[model samples]
Target: KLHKEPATLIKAIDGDTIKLMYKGQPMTFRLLLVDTPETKHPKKGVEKYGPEASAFTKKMVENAKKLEVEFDKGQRTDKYGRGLAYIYADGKMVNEALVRQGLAKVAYVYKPNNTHEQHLRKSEAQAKKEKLNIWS
Candidate 1:
């Protein structure tokens, strides 16, 4: 298990971004190492399969009894100013869970400091092989 700090979810902004409060401070986080289809894109509108991904993320997080987040070693936020993190719902890493469940894909490299990269790829392979939800 990675280091986790308790969070009070302000909201799930979309499939991969969330607004929360951690240790009394507001946090806007982008789920690290993966990207989901867009549910809210100003220019592109909602992309294909975006709503499903958003629904999955929203339902999962809202239903989770506990919420927590962990950051990478060297970087805590992305260039877009979103805190990059791994969110744990209760004890489950929602980042990996989304991929394993075929709601998102491994878009960014999770390597070096992120040892969970291999497992993420393998999980995504299985989802693709089985023609999971993301295939639709």
Candidate 2:
């Protein structure tokens, strides 16, 4: 089982990244096992469906009644010091939700942090079948 901690959403950087207030400290979390389209990458410019993905994250994080972060069994932070975590908004795993909605794709699977990979993959498969958003 993963360890969970309560958090407050400060803002969403994109579909797969967010800033949160945890333990009275501000931290940035890079959602594990998922990659969302980029709207702010200086070189990449705007990707297809990127704005929609960003908007979806903003809406979900802002509207959630409660937010939480969960840590997998491996390393907690990335090389850039961003917390690698699974986000829960009102008890729903927002990482999987993004995949289910086709706003994000499963990627960056480092085994130590892949506890939730199967679930995310399943969501991605369903999203693909439905041709939602990015998949369309």
Candidate 3:
């Protein structure tokens, strides 16, 4: 089973990152299973397709009627203090949505934190087959 809690948007940092008010504290969340191209990395130039990925996520989060965060029973916070979780906007999982649209790719796989791993990979495969965005 997964753990879930309500969250409200603080702001979007990039495609795979955002800051949300969780438990009344502002916390940064990095999507669990997908990685979008970098848009705000200090050491790198804005990556290809990064802007569109950011745009999609910001739109979804800002327009959501409800927002929630889910933890996979794994390590909740990374070394950088960012919470690693799946984000749900409205009712849809935005982590999977980004991959399904090919705006992000399935990456990171730390054990015990893979509850939705297969589902996300399947979405990526479909997006790959369609040759969308980053997959193009």
Best by lDDT: 3
Per-residue lDDT of 1-136 in model 3, one digit per residue for the tens? Answer: 8867899999999999999999999999999989899988778869999999999999999999999999888899989999999999988999999999999999879898999999999999999999999989
Model 2: lDDT equals 0.91
Task: Sort all candidates by lDDT, best to worst.
Answer: 3, 2, 1
Q: Per-residue lDDT for 1-136 in model 2, tens only?
A: 8878999988888877899998899999999999988988879978988998888888989999989899999999999899999998889998898899999999969988999999899999999999999888
Q: Candidate 3: how many backbone clashes? A: 0
Report the candidate with higher lDDT, 1 versus 3.
3
Clashes of each: 0, 0, 0
Ten residues in sequence with the least summed lDDT for candidate 3: 36-45
**Candidates 1 and 3, the one with greater TM-score:** 3
How does each model score on TM-score?
0.91, 0.96, 0.97
- Every model: Cα RMSD to truth: 1.7, 1.0, 0.8
- Over 4 Å off, model 2: none
lDDT against true structure, model 1: 0.85
Off by over 4 Å in 3: none
lDDT of 1 by residue, 39-104 (tens): 789899798778888888889899999998887775787777788888889898888988998889
Q: On a 0 to 1 TM-score scale, where does candidate 2 land against the true structure?
A: 0.96
